[PDB]
Amino acid sequence: GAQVSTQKTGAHIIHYTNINYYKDSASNSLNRQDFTQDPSKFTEPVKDVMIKTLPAL
Amino acid sequence: RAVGRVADTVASGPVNTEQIPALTAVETGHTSQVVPSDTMQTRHVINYHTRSESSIENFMGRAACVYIAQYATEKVNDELDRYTNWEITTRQVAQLRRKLEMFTYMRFDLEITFVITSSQRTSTTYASDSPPLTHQVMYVPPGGPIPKSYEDFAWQTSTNPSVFWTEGNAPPRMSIPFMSVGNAYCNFYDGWSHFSQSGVYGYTTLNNMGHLYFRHVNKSTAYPVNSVARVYFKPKHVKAWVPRAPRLCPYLKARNVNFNVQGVTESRNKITLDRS
Amino acid sequence: GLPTMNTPGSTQFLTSDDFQSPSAMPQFDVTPEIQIPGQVRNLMEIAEVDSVVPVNNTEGHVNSMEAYRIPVRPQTSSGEQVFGFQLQPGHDSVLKHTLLGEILNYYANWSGSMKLTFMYCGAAMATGKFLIAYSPPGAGVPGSRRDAMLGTHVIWDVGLQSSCVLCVPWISQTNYRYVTSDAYTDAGYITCWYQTSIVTPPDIPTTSTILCFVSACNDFSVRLLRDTPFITQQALFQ
Amino acid sequence: DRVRSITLGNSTITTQECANVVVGYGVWPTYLSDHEATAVDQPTQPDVATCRFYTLESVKWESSSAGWWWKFPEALSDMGLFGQNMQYHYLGRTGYTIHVQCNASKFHQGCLLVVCVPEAEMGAATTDHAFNHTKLSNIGQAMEFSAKKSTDQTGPQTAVHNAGMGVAVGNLTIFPHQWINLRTNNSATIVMPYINSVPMDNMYRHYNFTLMVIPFAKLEHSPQASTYVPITVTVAPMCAEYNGLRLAGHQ
Amino acid sequence: DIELTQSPATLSVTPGDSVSLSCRASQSISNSLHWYQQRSHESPRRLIKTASAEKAKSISGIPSRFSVSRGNTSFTLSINSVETEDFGMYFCQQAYAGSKLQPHTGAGTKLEIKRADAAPTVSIFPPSSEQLTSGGASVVCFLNNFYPKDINVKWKIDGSERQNGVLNSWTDQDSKDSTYSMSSTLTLTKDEYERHNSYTCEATHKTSTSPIVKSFNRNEC
Amino acid sequence: QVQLQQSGGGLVKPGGSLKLSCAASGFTFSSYWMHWVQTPEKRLEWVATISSGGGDTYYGDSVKGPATISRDNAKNTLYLQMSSLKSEDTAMYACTGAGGSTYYFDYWGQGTTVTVSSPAAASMVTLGCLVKGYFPEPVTVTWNSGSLSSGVHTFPAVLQSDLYTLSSSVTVPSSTWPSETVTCNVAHPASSTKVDKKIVPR
Ligand SMILES: CCCCCCCCCCCCC/C=C/[C@H](O)[C@H](N)CO
């Protein structure tokens, strides 16, 4: 039941093993390693796509 | 590549074309995606920086104090009573409220940790031997039997969850699932309570969260002792929707969102700069 | 039983720990989530959409709508200064209660490049150009347009397209700069000058308007989370 | 290009000058799926009767004007079969296509900000008093902002540099916004989907969003030019469906 | 808590000249603070309101002579210029952040017209036969023409001082020559009245180092 | 405006049921009430007939809008003998009544009793009559049958167990005194009793 994942290391032995003890999904620890993102819903919320090299109007 | 690491700066050079990366039109509501290579001559720089600290889990996932409950072992008035309730909400402290108000609809599993201290009340004498006190914190769901006073029938917790903490141990801690009625916590509810558009306005109507009754388990001490219970919240498994703009004017009331009228920023002398 | 030993750091309450904890309502049935539009997974998605800045924040214009309106007039001699401020996006009086400023005050360090988008708001028949310089802090803030043309600058020509973007670079000896900045991590100075003039046909008013924006590019980052020095309180709100 | 041509039901909109159509948070409005619903009754779906362009009342843009706000779906409560099916129901789920338009000249100047803020919980004009429901929004009237502090008794706070919600007015650009700059632009068009934390909600006890039009750069012209330039807002519901039939409301 | 040490300092002003009131707070200082003057006719006379830095709201009666500003932790009120008639007694009041409620009213000071300082002049007169049969004795002495109230008054009856049943009063400003005056009402018995021969009235000033002696004849008819 | 005019004044007994009525010109409700004993004013109630925190159990219903009846000072405990005010709160210009006091000290009427002083002297002749030991503090002092009401110095009376003392100093030259006739007249509001006394000449 053990799950081995990587550790938050620097940039140029590094694993950690967590085991869920309790029988609830809300009683687990934090998953701090979801860095995914998509800013296209706030920066470019347009219907017709605008390319940078093209003129805008 | 990996996920979350920032983009790079590709190298460029002197250009002379009909392309206009600089010019744009903000009337479309479209923020420009201008890479710094599109304006000047940049070098190839590898960016190893990450956006780990700016995720919603690392931004909200820290403990913050919410409510400071006071209750003693001898009743002297109706604010230092033998027991003390708290209508459970995240809007009474200022620093956690401004973080939760940055998004409209949130959805988090809560995590509550109490730190409970004590201090003898001021009197004419202090010498007494007392065993270590036991504090009881009973969650009351919305629509349950509330304890009217001490030694009540409803302090038995036949279905309510509760803790029993001896002074001097590790602080109590328990996790709470997401327990709204809808699909998200509404941090902003522009609307009324009744269908006639009257009654109470704001997000007060959707704050049906229960209560939290603090008391001592011990019958009495020799001399009266005041206790303080500080409640810390830590939202985990957070999913936030519809980001708001962060509130500028400071808060006034714990129910609604009223405010003084404030200026936009701090002032300065002039619009220019006057040194060489 | 199994012989354990309490290490230093036991029975403590660290504020930023991630430990498991026993649930209070076991086998709770949560309410199923739905596709709600506008989800955020990162604070830099909020700090990447633009927001206007109060460049005209001389007293008393901060508690009014004339804080964002930069006055632009037909000059009588070219090379004057339209405005100017320091590039401290967490401590300057201009860029700290904006959207990029109100996020970066929650953190202690920042990095990357910003985008100052300038949008004209005058008549359709008014023309003219501007010079928007950015001088890194070698020899102080520049004095005139000749002394600012040596730095990083763009010459925005107001025309059919209504708005240009000066993209400030990332020129620093440190990989991160503090928001409440000291003298070790100075960033630079932003000026904006009249290139030629503002010329008009007759029956057009003199005063025009330029709205400045601020954003972040695709390589912005923050670090070292804190609490913001923007909201204070004495007691609990009741 | 600049030319757009919107058509919904039997009432179209033709604009020679436009910027682009910002669509919500990047999603087109659609009906409720079978795995997100909570009701069990079969909903009604009038597609030509409700999903059409309704033109609201006109407002006047002068030099010393502060701004205006409409609250939806209260501003469409008396317009056609949209406001008649609103009274005979309990739940509603619509998306919108807000089309604000203002033409002056090639000699005028000015700039608006057409934004749609979901859950615009407004602060009161005076604190420690709940206010009247007719001072947030009426059935068709455009409630206006002010330049100074509103020392009212049963109204909202209409400080234009605070936008009624206590936030600085500059940071309203996170919400789906467009600028009507009279130098280039003429009309702003936004397509905003149904944004709520529940699948379907009542339409009288909950104003979903608030269309705000705020002049940032004030309007200047020569005195010889035409001094009356209006701002007309035509809003069209989109993908409307209703549930929970009932008698006539609304109380 | 909530301590207001309002409102130093005003003594005394010239008609047409300036003074600067002040008020301090120690509770939640970013409130909706204002002022409230008062004169003993009631006569409300509200004068100013400010919230929170800008938006000063002077009244229509005095719209161009006051000025309030803050802060911090204290706030002032400058007057240019005072004119008689004027209050009186000035109070520093507060509210919460809405809020035209006026709670939290602290103590306050006074300010009046400008005169030269003048010593109080006391004079005593023979009584009538209206207090004889009742067993009492109401000896009459009316002072005249003093300013300000930094004086002293005494009742030395032929070398015998009386503090039992004495009466003290201070009038407001009379409108013929801007004078002030006090009164005297005594309550003696029968056996103590005729023990003396001529009652003596004295009053001191801060300028004069000696009281004024006035003698009347009781048995004169 | 025009506030109010509240009437005023109240009356004994503190057994209960005291009412204070006012009028207005608009003003749909924003009225308050304020009372003071010897200090700066207190504050009850709020911008309604709703209660305040810290005030006593008397919380009066006030009708809407321009009548606001009443204070409803039920079950007095003789602490509340004070002077009440009533603000309106619709700028411009937020002025009060400012009502009338209510102490009034049961029960007897106490018609007026005077002890007139006769001056006997110098270049000025000062004259005043000692209205002594009266219950009702309202009076109306009239000198020289309605001609010498200019130099009258109205003095504060002092309470020592239901007795008051007003005195009105009038100053004449020696062109009338001691030849002509001088007499102070008191029009009495509460009991309507007439006093007339002549200064004896030497
Ligand atoms: C005392 C034994 C442990 C039980 C602890 C108490 C359980 C209650 C936890 C509260 C659950 C969160 C409810 C929502 C909180 C805020 O009001 C929302 N953000 C506003 O709707």
From TrEMBL, chain A:
What this protein is reported to do is described as: Lies on the inner surface of the capsid shell. After binding to the host receptor, the capsid undergoes conformational changes. Capsid protein VP4 is released, Capsid protein VP1 N-terminus is externalized, and together, they shape a pore in the host membrane through which the viral genome is translocated into the host cell cytoplasm. Component of immature procapsids, which is cleaved into capsid proteins VP4 and VP2 after maturation. Allows the capsid to remain inactive before the maturation step.
* Localization per Swiss-Prot or TrEMBL: Host cell; Virion
What gene is this protein translated from?
VP4-VP2
| Name recorded for this polypeptide | Genome polyprotein
Concerning its family, UniProt says: Belongs to the picornaviruses polyprotein family.
Subunit-level organization:
Interacts with capsid protein VP1 and capsid protein VP3 to form heterotrimeric protomers.
Source organism of the structure? Echovirus E30
Query: Span within the entire protein?
Result: 2 to 68 of 131
